[PDB]
Amino acid sequence: DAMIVIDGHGIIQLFSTAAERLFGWSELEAIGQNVNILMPEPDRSRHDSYISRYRTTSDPHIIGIGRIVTGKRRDGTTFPMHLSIGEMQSGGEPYFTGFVRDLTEHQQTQARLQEL
Ligand code: HEM
């Protein structure tokens, strides 16, 4: 589907093959980058605080809720995707995993039916 693992600072730790196809970064390019490289403004500039905020408050806004958001490709094109976040820990540090479902086709079908 598309899978991404980040550390508690938002740095990409793992980047699945499907993720590469979906976003247009290669694994090496992507690893060691902030996850925000995947989103547009204003979310890009806020994502760190989203993360900071959750770590302190421990109130989920998307964790085990899911949400549809706009994702951003390497070539600058944006698209809708469903996102679910999981919390994990390893070596005492927290890790987040995101499962992505590309909603591009659903949106286009819907737009196209509306337009007709
Ligand atoms: C690529 C496009 C993404 C966008 C546009 C996005 C957007 C957001 C937004 C809007 C929030 C805050 C929700 C709120 O305050 O109401 C948030 C929180 C968060 N995001 Fe993302 N996200 C993206 C990808 C990811 C990925 C791939 C991960 C992890 C692998 C991730 C990890 C988190 C975490 C850990 C939080 C705080 C958790 C929570 O509040 O439940 N994000 N993100």
mmCIF file with all atom_site columns, C-alpha atoms and ligand atoms in Angstrom:
data_model
loop_
_atom_site.group_PDB
_atom_site.id
_atom_site.type_symbol
_atom_site.label_atom_id
_atom_site.label_alt_id
_atom_site.label_comp_id
_atom_site.label_asym_id
_atom_site.label_entity_id
_atom_site.label_seq_id
_atom_site.pdbx_PDB_ins_code
_atom_site.Cartn_x
_atom_site.Cartn_y
_atom_site.Cartn_z
_atom_site.occupancy
_atom_site.B_iso_or_equiv
_atom_site.pdbx_formal_charge
_atom_site.auth_seq_id
_atom_site.auth_comp_id
_atom_site.auth_asym_id
_atom_site.auth_atom_id
_atom_site.pdbx_PDB_model_num
ATOM   1   C  CA  . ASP A 1 1   ? 0.000   0.000  0.000   1.00 0.00 ? 1   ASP A CA  1
ATOM   2   C  CA  . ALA A 1 2   ? 2.803   2.457  1.127   1.00 0.00 ? 2   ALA A CA  1
ATOM   3   C  CA  . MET A 1 3   ? 4.537   2.397  4.479   1.00 0.00 ? 3   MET A CA  1
ATOM   4   C  CA  . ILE A 1 4   ? 6.700   4.874  6.357   1.00 0.00 ? 4   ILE A CA  1
ATOM   5   C  CA  . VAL A 1 5   ? 8.430   4.708  9.688   1.00 0.00 ? 5   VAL A CA  1
ATOM   6   C  CA  . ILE A 1 6   ? 9.671   7.800  11.550  1.00 0.00 ? 6   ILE A CA  1
ATOM   7   C  CA  . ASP A 1 7   ? 11.418  8.445  14.791  1.00 0.00 ? 7   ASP A CA  1
ATOM   8   C  CA  . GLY A 1 8   ? 9.992   10.688 17.482  1.00 0.00 ? 8   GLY A CA  1
ATOM   9   C  CA  . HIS A 1 9   ? 11.562  13.684 15.682  1.00 0.00 ? 9   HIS A CA  1
ATOM   10  C  CA  . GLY A 1 10  ? 9.909   12.960 12.354  1.00 0.00 ? 10  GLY A CA  1
ATOM   11  C  CA  . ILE A 1 11  ? 12.970  11.620 10.665  1.00 0.00 ? 11  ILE A CA  1
ATOM   12  C  CA  . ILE A 1 12  ? 12.283  8.878  8.197   1.00 0.00 ? 12  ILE A CA  1
ATOM   13  C  CA  . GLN A 1 13  ? 13.745  5.569  9.371   1.00 0.00 ? 13  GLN A CA  1
ATOM   14  C  CA  . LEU A 1 14  ? 12.116  3.226  6.858   1.00 0.00 ? 14  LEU A CA  1
ATOM   15  C  CA  . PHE A 1 15  ? 10.579  3.724  3.475   1.00 0.00 ? 15  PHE A CA  1
ATOM   16  C  CA  . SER A 1 16  ? 8.805   0.866  1.677   1.00 0.00 ? 16  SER A CA  1
ATOM   17  C  CA  . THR A 1 17  ? 9.098   0.057  -2.008  1.00 0.00 ? 17  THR A CA  1
ATOM   18  C  CA  . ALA A 1 18  ? 5.481   1.093  -2.612  1.00 0.00 ? 18  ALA A CA  1
ATOM   19  C  CA  . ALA A 1 19  ? 6.292   4.362  -0.816  1.00 0.00 ? 19  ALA A CA  1
ATOM   20  C  CA  . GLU A 1 20  ? 9.007   4.982  -3.501  1.00 0.00 ? 20  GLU A CA  1
ATOM   21  C  CA  . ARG A 1 21  ? 6.517   4.382  -6.292  1.00 0.00 ? 21  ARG A CA  1
ATOM   22  C  CA  . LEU A 1 22  ? 3.939   6.501  -4.589  1.00 0.00 ? 22  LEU A CA  1
ATOM   23  C  CA  . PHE A 1 23  ? 6.047   9.508  -3.658  1.00 0.00 ? 23  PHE A CA  1
ATOM   24  C  CA  . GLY A 1 24  ? 8.903   9.399  -6.194  1.00 0.00 ? 24  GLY A CA  1
ATOM   25  C  CA  . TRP A 1 25  ? 11.809  9.433  -3.701  1.00 0.00 ? 25  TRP A CA  1
ATOM   26  C  CA  . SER A 1 26  ? 14.094  6.477  -3.439  1.00 0.00 ? 26  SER A CA  1
ATOM   27  C  CA  . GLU A 1 27  ? 14.640  4.807  -0.121  1.00 0.00 ? 27  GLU A CA  1
ATOM   28  C  CA  . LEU A 1 28  ? 18.139  6.401  0.326   1.00 0.00 ? 28  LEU A CA  1
ATOM   29  C  CA  . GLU A 1 29  ? 16.963  9.812  -0.685  1.00 0.00 ? 29  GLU A CA  1
ATOM   30  C  CA  . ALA A 1 30  ? 14.078  9.547  1.748   1.00 0.00 ? 30  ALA A CA  1
ATOM   31  C  CA  . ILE A 1 31  ? 15.836  8.042  4.774   1.00 0.00 ? 31  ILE A CA  1
ATOM   32  C  CA  . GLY A 1 32  ? 17.298  10.652 7.040   1.00 0.00 ? 32  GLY A CA  1
ATOM   33  C  CA  . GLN A 1 33  ? 14.844  13.318 5.805   1.00 0.00 ? 33  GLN A CA  1
ATOM   34  C  CA  . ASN A 1 34  ? 12.048  14.895 7.754   1.00 0.00 ? 34  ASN A CA  1
ATOM   35  C  CA  . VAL A 1 35  ? 8.694   13.280 6.930   1.00 0.00 ? 35  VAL A CA  1
ATOM   36  C  CA  . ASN A 1 36  ? 7.460   16.830 6.059   1.00 0.00 ? 36  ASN A CA  1
ATOM   37  C  CA  . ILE A 1 37  ? 9.160   16.602 2.717   1.00 0.00 ? 37  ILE A CA  1
ATOM   38  C  CA  . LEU A 1 38  ? 6.030   14.619 1.851   1.00 0.00 ? 38  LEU A CA  1
ATOM   39  C  CA  . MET A 1 39  ? 3.483   17.332 2.532   1.00 0.00 ? 39  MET A CA  1
ATOM   40  C  CA  . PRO A 1 40  ? 2.597   20.821 1.367   1.00 0.00 ? 40  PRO A CA  1
ATOM   41  C  CA  . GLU A 1 41  ? 2.455   24.002 3.345   1.00 0.00 ? 41  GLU A CA  1
ATOM   42  C  CA  . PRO A 1 42  ? 1.045   24.940 5.789   1.00 0.00 ? 42  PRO A CA  1
ATOM   43  C  CA  . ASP A 1 43  ? 1.284   21.319 7.079   1.00 0.00 ? 43  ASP A CA  1
ATOM   44  C  CA  . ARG A 1 44  ? 4.943   20.970 6.118   1.00 0.00 ? 44  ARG A CA  1
ATOM   45  C  CA  . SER A 1 45  ? 5.975   23.791 8.524   1.00 0.00 ? 45  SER A CA  1
ATOM   46  C  CA  . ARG A 1 46  ? 3.699   22.674 11.270  1.00 0.00 ? 46  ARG A CA  1
ATOM   47  C  CA  . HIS A 1 47  ? 4.233   18.877 11.241  1.00 0.00 ? 47  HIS A CA  1
ATOM   48  C  CA  . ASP A 1 48  ? 7.092   18.999 13.840  1.00 0.00 ? 48  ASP A CA  1
ATOM   49  C  CA  . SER A 1 49  ? 4.819   20.828 16.274  1.00 0.00 ? 49  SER A CA  1
ATOM   50  C  CA  . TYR A 1 50  ? 2.063   18.262 15.585  1.00 0.00 ? 50  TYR A CA  1
ATOM   51  C  CA  . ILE A 1 51  ? 4.554   15.678 16.673  1.00 0.00 ? 51  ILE A CA  1
ATOM   52  C  CA  . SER A 1 52  ? 5.928   17.735 19.645  1.00 0.00 ? 52  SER A CA  1
ATOM   53  C  CA  . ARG A 1 53  ? 2.385   18.423 20.727  1.00 0.00 ? 53  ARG A CA  1
ATOM   54  C  CA  . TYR A 1 54  ? 1.356   14.738 20.830  1.00 0.00 ? 54  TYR A CA  1
ATOM   55  C  CA  . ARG A 1 55  ? 4.483   13.608 22.730  1.00 0.00 ? 55  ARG A CA  1
ATOM   56  C  CA  . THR A 1 56  ? 3.744   16.064 25.587  1.00 0.00 ? 56  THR A CA  1
ATOM   57  C  CA  . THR A 1 57  ? -0.066  15.983 25.702  1.00 0.00 ? 57  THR A CA  1
ATOM   58  C  CA  . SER A 1 58  ? -0.513  12.315 24.677  1.00 0.00 ? 58  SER A CA  1
ATOM   59  C  CA  . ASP A 1 59  ? -3.826  13.218 23.005  1.00 0.00 ? 59  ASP A CA  1
ATOM   60  C  CA  . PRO A 1 60  ? -4.276  11.508 19.637  1.00 0.00 ? 60  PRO A CA  1
ATOM   61  C  CA  . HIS A 1 61  ? -5.634  13.603 16.759  1.00 0.00 ? 61  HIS A CA  1
ATOM   62  C  CA  . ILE A 1 62  ? -4.907  11.020 14.070  1.00 0.00 ? 62  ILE A CA  1
ATOM   63  C  CA  . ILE A 1 63  ? -3.386  8.089  15.991  1.00 0.00 ? 63  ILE A CA  1
ATOM   64  C  CA  . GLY A 1 64  ? -5.866  5.252  15.742  1.00 0.00 ? 64  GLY A CA  1
ATOM   65  C  CA  . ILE A 1 65  ? -8.343  7.702  14.175  1.00 0.00 ? 65  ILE A CA  1
ATOM   66  C  CA  . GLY A 1 66  ? -7.178  7.850  10.526  1.00 0.00 ? 66  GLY A CA  1
ATOM   67  C  CA  . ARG A 1 67  ? -7.541  10.839 8.224   1.00 0.00 ? 67  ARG A CA  1
ATOM   68  C  CA  . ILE A 1 68  ? -7.645  11.832 4.567   1.00 0.00 ? 68  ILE A CA  1
ATOM   69  C  CA  . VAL A 1 69  ? -4.981  14.401 3.760   1.00 0.00 ? 69  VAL A CA  1
ATOM   70  C  CA  . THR A 1 70  ? -3.104  15.885 0.863   1.00 0.00 ? 70  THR A CA  1
ATOM   71  C  CA  . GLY A 1 71  ? 0.239   14.267 0.175   1.00 0.00 ? 71  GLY A CA  1
ATOM   72  C  CA  . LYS A 1 72  ? 2.951   15.744 -2.052  1.00 0.00 ? 72  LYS A CA  1
ATOM   73  C  CA  . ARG A 1 73  ? 5.122   14.018 -4.667  1.00 0.00 ? 73  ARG A CA  1
ATOM   74  C  CA  . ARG A 1 74  ? 8.803   14.623 -5.519  1.00 0.00 ? 74  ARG A CA  1
ATOM   75  C  CA  . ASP A 1 75  ? 7.691   16.352 -8.749  1.00 0.00 ? 75  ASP A CA  1
ATOM   76  C  CA  . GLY A 1 76  ? 5.549   18.780 -6.720  1.00 0.00 ? 76  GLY A CA  1
ATOM   77  C  CA  . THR A 1 77  ? 2.137   17.264 -7.657  1.00 0.00 ? 77  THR A CA  1
ATOM   78  C  CA  . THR A 1 78  ? -0.290  16.831 -4.766  1.00 0.00 ? 78  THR A CA  1
ATOM   79  C  CA  . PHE A 1 79  ? -2.837  14.068 -4.163  1.00 0.00 ? 79  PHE A CA  1
ATOM   80  C  CA  . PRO A 1 80  ? -5.286  12.699 -1.601  1.00 0.00 ? 80  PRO A CA  1
ATOM   81  C  CA  . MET A 1 81  ? -4.423  9.777  0.554   1.00 0.00 ? 81  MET A CA  1
ATOM   82  C  CA  . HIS A 1 82  ? -5.825  8.086  3.524   1.00 0.00 ? 82  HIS A CA  1
ATOM   83  C  CA  . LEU A 1 83  ? -3.427  7.958  6.448   1.00 0.00 ? 83  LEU A CA  1
ATOM   84  C  CA  . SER A 1 84  ? -3.329  5.777  9.599   1.00 0.00 ? 84  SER A CA  1
ATOM   85  C  CA  . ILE A 1 85  ? -0.712  6.208  12.203  1.00 0.00 ? 85  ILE A CA  1
ATOM   86  C  CA  . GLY A 1 86  ? 0.558   3.602  14.629  1.00 0.00 ? 86  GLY A CA  1
ATOM   87  C  CA  . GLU A 1 87  ? 2.626   4.116  17.747  1.00 0.00 ? 87  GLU A CA  1
ATOM   88  C  CA  . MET A 1 88  ? 5.482   1.794  18.508  1.00 0.00 ? 88  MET A CA  1
ATOM   89  C  CA  . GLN A 1 89  ? 8.642   1.791  20.526  1.00 0.00 ? 89  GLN A CA  1
ATOM   90  C  CA  . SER A 1 90  ? 12.062  0.281  20.031  1.00 0.00 ? 90  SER A CA  1
ATOM   91  C  CA  . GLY A 1 91  ? 15.230  0.758  22.117  1.00 0.00 ? 91  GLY A CA  1
ATOM   92  C  CA  . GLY A 1 92  ? 13.084  2.868  24.511  1.00 0.00 ? 92  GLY A CA  1
ATOM   93  C  CA  . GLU A 1 93  ? 12.421  5.430  21.767  1.00 0.00 ? 93  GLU A CA  1
ATOM   94  C  CA  . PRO A 1 94  ? 8.986   5.876  20.147  1.00 0.00 ? 94  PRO A CA  1
ATOM   95  C  CA  . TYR A 1 95  ? 8.496   5.250  16.446  1.00 0.00 ? 95  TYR A CA  1
ATOM   96  C  CA  . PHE A 1 96  ? 5.601   6.069  14.258  1.00 0.00 ? 96  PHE A CA  1
ATOM   97  C  CA  . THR A 1 97  ? 4.406   4.120  11.320  1.00 0.00 ? 97  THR A CA  1
ATOM   98  C  CA  . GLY A 1 98  ? 2.119   5.532  8.682   1.00 0.00 ? 98  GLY A CA  1
ATOM   99  C  CA  . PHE A 1 99  ? 0.025   3.460  6.302   1.00 0.00 ? 99  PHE A CA  1
ATOM   100 C  CA  . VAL A 1 100 ? -0.944  5.219  3.227   1.00 0.00 ? 100 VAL A CA  1
ATOM   101 C  CA  . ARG A 1 101 ? -3.786  4.543  0.819   1.00 0.00 ? 101 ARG A CA  1
ATOM   102 C  CA  . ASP A 1 102 ? -3.753  6.532  -2.370  1.00 0.00 ? 102 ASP A CA  1
ATOM   103 C  CA  . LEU A 1 103 ? -7.151  8.024  -3.025  1.00 0.00 ? 103 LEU A CA  1
ATOM   104 C  CA  . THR A 1 104 ? -6.355  9.646  -6.371  1.00 0.00 ? 104 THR A CA  1
ATOM   105 C  CA  . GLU A 1 105 ? -8.590  7.474  -8.508  1.00 0.00 ? 105 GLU A CA  1
ATOM   106 C  CA  . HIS A 1 106 ? -11.593 7.768  -6.090  1.00 0.00 ? 106 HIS A CA  1
ATOM   107 C  CA  . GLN A 1 107 ? -11.308 11.523 -6.226  1.00 0.00 ? 107 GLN A CA  1
ATOM   108 C  CA  . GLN A 1 108 ? -11.120 11.638 -10.035 1.00 0.00 ? 108 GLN A CA  1
ATOM   109 C  CA  . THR A 1 109 ? -14.067 9.298  -10.511 1.00 0.00 ? 109 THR A CA  1
ATOM   110 C  CA  . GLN A 1 110 ? -16.057 11.395 -8.076  1.00 0.00 ? 110 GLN A CA  1
ATOM   111 C  CA  . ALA A 1 111 ? -15.038 14.700 -9.730  1.00 0.00 ? 111 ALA A CA  1
ATOM   112 C  CA  . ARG A 1 112 ? -15.810 13.237 -13.140 1.00 0.00 ? 112 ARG A CA  1
ATOM   113 C  CA  . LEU A 1 113 ? -19.278 11.991 -12.103 1.00 0.00 ? 113 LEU A CA  1
ATOM   114 C  CA  . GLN A 1 114 ? -20.021 15.398 -10.626 1.00 0.00 ? 114 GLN A CA  1
ATOM   115 C  CA  . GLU A 1 115 ? -18.942 17.161 -13.726 1.00 0.00 ? 115 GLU A CA  1
ATOM   116 C  CA  . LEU A 1 116 ? -21.311 15.036 -15.794 1.00 0.00 ? 116 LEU A CA  1
HETATM 117 C  C1  . HEM B 2 .   ? 2.485   13.038 4.062   1.00 0.00 ? 1   HEM B C1  1
HETATM 118 C  C2  . HEM B 2 .   ? 1.473   13.815 4.462   1.00 0.00 ? 1   HEM B C2  1
HETATM 119 C  C3  . HEM B 2 .   ? 1.107   14.036 5.950   1.00 0.00 ? 1   HEM B C3  1
HETATM 120 C  C4  . HEM B 2 .   ? 0.326   15.031 6.357   1.00 0.00 ? 1   HEM B C4  1
HETATM 121 C  C5  . HEM B 2 .   ? -0.305  16.083 5.428   1.00 0.00 ? 1   HEM B C5  1
HETATM 122 C  C6  . HEM B 2 .   ? 0.168   14.946 7.802   1.00 0.00 ? 1   HEM B C6  1
HETATM 123 C  C7  . HEM B 2 .   ? -0.588  15.815 8.560   1.00 0.00 ? 1   HEM B C7  1
HETATM 124 C  C8  . HEM B 2 .   ? -0.736  15.827 9.928   1.00 0.00 ? 1   HEM B C8  1
HETATM 125 C  C9  . HEM B 2 .   ? -1.672  16.656 10.694  1.00 0.00 ? 1   HEM B C9  1
HETATM 126 C  C10 . HEM B 2 .   ? -2.682  17.698 10.115  1.00 0.00 ? 1   HEM B C10 1
HETATM 127 C  C11 . HEM B 2 .   ? -1.514  16.355 12.002  1.00 0.00 ? 1   HEM B C11 1
HETATM 128 C  C12 . HEM B 2 .   ? -2.219  17.008 13.205  1.00 0.00 ? 1   HEM B C12 1
HETATM 129 C  C13 . HEM B 2 .   ? -3.662  16.616 13.397  1.00 0.00 ? 1   HEM B C13 1
HETATM 130 C  C14 . HEM B 2 .   ? -4.289  17.717 14.211  1.00 0.00 ? 1   HEM B C14 1
HETATM 131 O  O1  . HEM B 2 .   ? -3.537  18.436 14.934  1.00 0.00 ? 1   HEM B O1  1
HETATM 132 O  O2  . HEM B 2 .   ? -5.544  17.864 14.143  1.00 0.00 ? 1   HEM B O2  1
HETATM 133 C  C15 . HEM B 2 .   ? -0.480  15.341 12.102  1.00 0.00 ? 1   HEM B C15 1
HETATM 134 C  C16 . HEM B 2 .   ? -0.012  14.788 13.266  1.00 0.00 ? 1   HEM B C16 1
HETATM 135 C  C17 . HEM B 2 .   ? 0.877   13.756 13.316  1.00 0.00 ? 1   HEM B C17 1
HETATM 136 N  N1  . HEM B 2 .   ? 1.495   13.143 12.218  1.00 0.00 ? 1   HEM B N1  1
HETATM 137 FE FE1 . HEM B 2 .   ? 1.143   13.535 10.286  1.00 0.00 ? 1   HEM B FE1 1
HETATM 138 N  N2  . HEM B 2 .   ? 0.897   13.841 8.252   1.00 0.00 ? 1   HEM B N2  1
HETATM 139 C  C18 . HEM B 2 .   ? 1.478   13.269 7.129   1.00 0.00 ? 1   HEM B C18 1
HETATM 140 C  C19 . HEM B 2 .   ? 2.263   12.163 7.166   1.00 0.00 ? 1   HEM B C19 1
HETATM 141 C  C20 . HEM B 2 .   ? 2.666   11.589 8.333   1.00 0.00 ? 1   HEM B C20 1
HETATM 142 C  C21 . HEM B 2 .   ? 3.390   10.348 8.435   1.00 0.00 ? 1   HEM B C21 1
HETATM 143 C  C22 . HEM B 2 .   ? 3.780   9.532  7.180   1.00 0.00 ? 1   HEM B C22 1
HETATM 144 C  C23 . HEM B 2 .   ? 3.626   10.076 9.747   1.00 0.00 ? 1   HEM B C23 1
HETATM 145 C  C24 . HEM B 2 .   ? 4.352   8.879  10.465  1.00 0.00 ? 1   HEM B C24 1
HETATM 146 C  C25 . HEM B 2 .   ? 4.924   7.802  9.893   1.00 0.00 ? 1   HEM B C25 1
HETATM 147 C  C26 . HEM B 2 .   ? 3.042   11.172 10.491  1.00 0.00 ? 1   HEM B C26 1
HETATM 148 C  C27 . HEM B 2 .   ? 3.094   11.277 11.863  1.00 0.00 ? 1   HEM B C27 1
HETATM 149 C  C28 . HEM B 2 .   ? 2.339   12.110 12.644  1.00 0.00 ? 1   HEM B C28 1
HETATM 150 C  C29 . HEM B 2 .   ? 2.283   12.028 14.083  1.00 0.00 ? 1   HEM B C29 1
HETATM 151 C  C30 . HEM B 2 .   ? 3.040   11.031 14.957  1.00 0.00 ? 1   HEM B C30 1
HETATM 152 C  C31 . HEM B 2 .   ? 1.323   13.132 14.532  1.00 0.00 ? 1   HEM B C31 1
HETATM 153 C  C32 . HEM B 2 .   ? 0.868   13.461 15.966  1.00 0.00 ? 1   HEM B C32 1
HETATM 154 C  C33 . HEM B 2 .   ? -0.065  12.278 16.278  1.00 0.00 ? 1   HEM B C33 1
HETATM 155 C  C34 . HEM B 2 .   ? -1.502  12.655 16.598  1.00 0.00 ? 1   HEM B C34 1
HETATM 156 O  O3  . HEM B 2 .   ? -1.795  13.870 16.819  1.00 0.00 ? 1   HEM B O3  1
HETATM 157 O  O4  . HEM B 2 .   ? -2.356  11.712 16.662  1.00 0.00 ? 1   HEM B O4  1
HETATM 158 N  N3  . HEM B 2 .   ? 2.455   12.077 9.598   1.00 0.00 ? 1   HEM B N3  1
HETATM 159 N  N4  . HEM B 2 .   ? -0.038  15.035 10.827  1.00 0.00 ? 1   HEM B N4  1
#
